[PDB]
Amino acid sequence: GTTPGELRELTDDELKDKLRESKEELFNLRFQMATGQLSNNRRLRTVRQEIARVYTVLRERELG
RNA sequence: AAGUGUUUAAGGGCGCAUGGUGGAUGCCUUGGCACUGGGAGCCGAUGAAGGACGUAGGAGGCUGCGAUAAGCCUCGGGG
C-alpha cells in the first residue's frame, strides 16, 4: 500500500507525514530486530525502500 | 687316526612385488598474449580519476550502491 502512484497522489505535507511515519516504523523495526523480536526481517527493507520512494517523489516534485 | 664339509645376517646390496610422499606427464580450462574490424576518443568546481567509511536479517572479502546506501523513480524489453 505504498506504491509510487499512491505516493504521487499524496500531497507534499502528506508525503512528509508518511515520511516521518515510515522513519518511526523503521526505528521500531531496528529496535525489534536488535532485541531479536522481529519475525519478518524483510520489513526493514520494505520500509527503507518506502522511505526512498517518498524522498524520490518529493524530489521529483521539487524538480518538476 | 688327519682331512673334507653345507649350515647364521646385527646390518647392507641387487632385483621383483606392493605401498606412501610428491606433483611431473597426458588431456583440459575460469585466465592470458598478439592482432583484425568497428564505436568512442576525453572526464572534472553540476566536484573528476581514484579512494576512506558505510550499506543486506545475520561475520568478512569481492561486486553493487551511498544515510533514498546489493538500492529509489520514469520509460522500454522479457515472461
Nucleic strand B under 7 Å from the C-beta of A52? yes
Q: Distance, angstroms, CA A35 to C1' B23?
A: 54
Phi-psi region of A36 (alpha: psi -120 to 50; beta: other; left: phi over 0): left
Q: Where are the domains of chain A?
A: 1-64
Could you tell me if A16 and A58 are in contact, meaning their C-beta atoms sit under 8 angstroms apart? yes
Solved using: cryo-EM
Nucleic strand B under 7 Å from the C-beta of A44? yes
CA separation for the pair A20, A38 (Å, rounded)? 21
Query: Any residues with CB less than 8 A from the CB of A52 and at least 6 apart, and which?
Result: none
Q: Distance, angstroms, CA A18 to C1' B47?
A: 33
Could you tell me if A10 and A18 are in contact, meaning their C-beta atoms sit under 8 angstroms apart? yes
